[model samples]
Each structure stands twice: as C-alpha cells, then as structure tokens.
Target: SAPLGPFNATLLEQLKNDYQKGEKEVTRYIELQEKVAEKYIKMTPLSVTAKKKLPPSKDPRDYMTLSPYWWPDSTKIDGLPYIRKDGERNPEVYEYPERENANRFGDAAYCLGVLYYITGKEVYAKACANHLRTWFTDPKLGMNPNMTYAQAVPGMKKMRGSGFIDSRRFSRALGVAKLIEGSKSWTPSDKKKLDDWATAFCYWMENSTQGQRESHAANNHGLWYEAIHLMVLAYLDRTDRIREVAEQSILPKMGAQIADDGSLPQELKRTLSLHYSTFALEALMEANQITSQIGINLWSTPASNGKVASQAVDYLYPFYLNPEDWKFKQIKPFDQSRAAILLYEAGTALGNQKYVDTAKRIGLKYSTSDVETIPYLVLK
Candidate 1:
C-alpha cells in the first residue's frame, strides 16, 4: 500500500515525540484537529439517501449535484437551461445531497483520522469506521463507485467530466483509513470492504468516459485529477500503476499546464485567477508529496517546457505576501494564505529555507483555520 504516504508510522511516531516536547506549531495544529473532531462528533452521519427533498435520482445511490456556476437565465421564460457565470457559485449546489455530503464526509473523515492518530482513541476510530462502512458498504445507502451523473444540469447536460473534481475529498478519506489501520475498530473484514470499494472507484476514475475527460482537464482540474488518481492508486496497493501515471501522465501534464514563466495561463484566465492558481499549486504540491513516497521527486523535475513547481511558487509568493499587487480578474478578495502549506511542503522538500521563512510569515499574517489539515500531514 505504498507504505502509507501521509500517516506513515515513523512520521507519526516522530510527531508524537515532537508534540510531547511542546513543539508550539505541532501543538497548535493538534489543537485545531481536536476542535474539528469535536465538531464532527456532533455531526449526524450523512448519506445520499437522506436527500429526500430533492427529486428522485435515476439511482438513489448514485451521487448527484447541480452545477455550481450555472444559474437560471433571467432572460428566458422558464430558465430551462442554466447559464454560466464564471467564478460565481450558485447557491443551488447546496440544495442537493452530493455536494454537501462530499464536503461533510471529507471534513469529518479527515478530522476523525487525525484525532485517532494523535490520541489513539477508539471512539474516533469507531466513528470513522461507521462513516466508511455506511458510505461504502451499505448497498441501500452507499454511493456507486462511478460518478456518471455528477454535476448534472436541470435541463441541459446530464453530467460533465468536471464533476470528478468533487471526489478530490477522497484524498482525506484515504488518510482516515490509513490512520485507523490495525486499530480494534477497523477490523480486517472492514478493511477489505473499504479496499474493494476504493479499488472499484480507482478503476472507474481511470477508465470511465467522465474520468478520461477529467484526466485531460486543462486547468486545476487536471492537477486535482492527478492528485486524486495517485492517492487512490496508492490506497489500492497498485505501485506499478502509480509509477506509470506519475512518470507518464502527471509529470507531463505538469510541464504542459505550468508555463516557463511559472504562470498557469489556463487558471489565470479565470475570474478567480489567483484562487485557482493557488489551487493548482496545492494540487501539484500534494501530488509531489505522494509521489515522493515512492522515491520520485516531482517538486524539482523540470517540466518538458522547462517549468517547475518552485517557479510557480516563486511567482505567487510575492502576491501572497502582498495581495493588493495582484492585477488579475479576481472578482472576490484574494486569499493566498492557503498556499502557505504548499510553500512549507516545497521548502522542506527542496531544502530551501527561504520558502520556509516566507511560509512562516504567511502563517503569522493569516489566521489559521480548520479548513486545512495538510500542514500536519506533509510538514514535520
């Protein structure tokens, strides 16, 4: 199983000692983990079956969601077909089961896993086990492995390949399962079922028509798809496939998407250019982190076009430090603080203390929130 990339036993052991020694940053990260876990404890276990308010889906177990950027055409009589407003999220996405459930599942599973690792609490493991079982094993409620109908429009398209982005949350779910490995609550039987489910999902992601479309997405979608692809393959214990995809697809895609000047031209063309740019960097950093477990150094690999992840980081670092300098079409306020986690990962991986120093400054300048847990996952 690719030796548990995020929650490796050795890394967790070291973190335990550092946290025990009152490492301030580690302590703060754990505190945030606890706060998130506490909230999760009170959360009701969610399922797609619970979305009774919405119209019946073709298959109730198949995950479904409305297009986030598409809204009613005000000029039309009945708004039969939705219109696209770039960078604007329509609130209608929240009215469905899939989006909310995906977000909740990702957030809760991540918190439960981190809490279980830090505290070794059976309760956390059990909670996570229940979530996994309900979401993957129960035939009546569990979502189908393929995302054939995700991001469907009311009257136009039934689905789009872009909907695969919704499953990016599975990265966290993978971490949760790894954290609970060998625990009493996570039995061998349970592990087998979860593994089987993930294996099917990974196959679908690689072979389905929607999955193939997502694989070639030009912007952050392609980066995120690769990240999710690597994680799932790692979970399925497909080391050979992981290496193949990393070297052939992911590495080449990085080179094509990231230009020599460190700019993501596709993402920069969006209304939320800065946000999407940082998002692409985060996905790349995360993909780099996973590939590193197998001894591949993607962070420093020169893309075929001579572009590297660090150059992207370098180009964005100045903007993160001074958001007002951004001249892009960001209809919303620029929030580059999330990129600090990427900077930290790149800094540590490349042995560049300057990136680490700048990351610390960004951390200090921006308030830390529970929205992120990767600092604990990737940083020491």
Candidate 2:
C-alpha cells in the first residue's frame, strides 16, 4: 500500500515490523499509549459550534478566531480596532482560541489513528474514525472547511490571511486517514465519505477568496498554505494536483521565500526569529515529504536560488545548541525543544546523522519530543 500525505511509507512499514519485535517504536508506542489512555478515557466530540462567540457570518461552522497578538488600543476608550503588539499575545485570544478545540481534535485523531494501526485495537479505530466524522464529516457539527473569519482582529479587516494558519492542525489528522482503512469503525464507504468531505474542503481551500489570500502570504502563513494543500491533496489521492502545485506554486514560493543559504528572510524578520525560522522549516519539511510521494523530493531538488529544503533545515542546526547566540527579539522564553520534530524529520529527509543525534539530544532535554506521541512513534 502506498503511503499517503506526509507519511513515510518505509517508516510505517518498518514500524509495523519493528513493533512485532518489541523494538524502539514499541517503546515509544508504550510511552504514548500510557499517556493517550487518559485522552481516550475523556475524549469528547469537538466541533466549531463549541465556540461560544460566533463569527460575523453567524454560522457556527465558519471558523472564527482573534489575532493572537492584537489588543485594545491604549488611547482609545473602546477597542474597536485592535493594535498589533509584536510577540505579545492578547489574553483575549486565549479565551477565544477558536474555542480551544481544533488542536485537541487533531491530537486525538493522530493518536488514535496510529494506535489503531499499530495495535489493531477496535476501540482505537472506532474512536479515531468517530472523531474524524465529528470534526469533518458531520453535517451539522463539522467545521465549514474555510477559514473566512479566522484570526479576525477587532475593527480590522474582519478576517486576515494569517488566520489560515489555524488549519495546519488538520494536515496530519487528515493524512492519517489511510491508516484506519480496514477498521470496522471506518469502513470503505466511511472512508469514501471522508474522501468526499476532503474534496469539498480542498475546493474551498484552493479557490475561495480567503484561500487565495493565504496563498499569497510572504511568511509562515504562505508556507503553511502550501503545506495544508499538500496534505489535503494527498488525502484526496490527487497526485497530479500535488505535482502541479509543487512545480507551479511551491517551487516559486521556495525560491522567493527561502534564502540563498536557507535563512528564511521572511521568517527571520518576525519578532521571534528563531521560533518562526523552525516553524517555516516545518512547513518546508512537510511539503518535502508530500512531494516525495510523487518523486519531486523538495529536500533533494533545487528550487531556484539553489534552495533545497535541507538547506533551510541545516541553517537551524547550530542555533539549537546556542540559543544565546540568537540575536532576535524573543519576547517569550525560546522553546528550543520545538525543534525536535524538524530535526527528527530532517535527519531522515536529508540523510544527516547529526540531525537525528541533535534531535535525540533535545528529546532527552525536553519530554515534549517523545510526548508528542504520533510523530515520536512514526517519524523515525
């Protein structure tokens, strides 16, 4: 069976064999299952309607969220139009968090998707499939699949392309649909339903006004815009669209955005330079994986300016060991551990042993690396 989306076919097959032998992935599996059991015990269905504050659309399914760093004007009596504070989050966004449910849904879907595939547990498959149905397939409850009003700032444009970043959570969650194929909980017909749902959502993603706005973003949002489309097209099993996008849009995006030496200039310009540098690379790495499925490996191929995905990844390596040297304005504590996945992934994609070694170094430093569950079990 072919691997879908950003999933590594070899790794997944190797994982299956190694799990049978009680290998390293199994250790990770146990570590995760122990943690995930708590989620399974309390997992409730999630939906956009869960958000108390509705979008201006007045449709619960229309995703709505506030700009993370925007706050009330200091001088204005009423916070009609928000002010942008670089790197400082408005607490009001915390109360919103798009109702704080999408990330949880993605986590549960990825967790249970892999757990079921590895363990063949009926419960895991059923729960994972059901979660997808609720979040994606349900008519009344599922998200509308377009981020029309996401990251909406008070008295601003009402919706910003930056809000499209929220949908990146669905990338892996949707990609893992291939793993749950045979489960009684997710029959072929049910899978087709998800497929149909994916098709509809992708149509909006690529063609909608908001989607087009996001695609033109010059920074991390632009990267995620391509990355999100890659995952959805992979799930939809549209290799032609994936290849077309890689050649036409993503290649140009890489050339324009990623620097000659892989120092994403757009990301570097951000207030949290190092944080967003890795974040952009995550998008690049993901785009690399999906393109690899169709033989257009982004890590290997030069996308003008002599840019390969690995170059950007390589640029970030030294900073992991020397955060003090990062001369960027990081208003929050730099979480070096966030680089764990980027390095783990780069190790495999770029054939660099140090990437893996450094990944494990930070994995040891931060529990988050291993505790991430699905990627921890599958990426290696």
List the candidate 1 regions with Cα displacement exceeding 4 Å. Answer: 1-3, 6-13, 19-32, 53-57, 364-371, 374-380
Kindly list the per-residue Cα lDDT of model 1 for residues 237-266, writing each as its tens digit: 677887888888887888788776788899
Query: How well is each residue in 270-308 modelled by candidate 2, as lDDT tens digits?
Result: 888888887877787788778876788776667756667
Clashes, model 2: 0
- Clashing residue pairs, backbone N/CA/C < 3 A, model 2: none
Q: What are the TM-scores, per candidate, against the unseen true structure?
A: 0.90, 0.91
Local error of candidate 2 at residue 345 (angstroms) = 1.6
Q: Provide the clashing-pair count of each candidate structure.
A: 0, 0
Candidate 1 — worst ten consecutive residues by lDDT sum? Answer: 1-10
Best by TM-score: 2
Which pairs clash in model 1? none
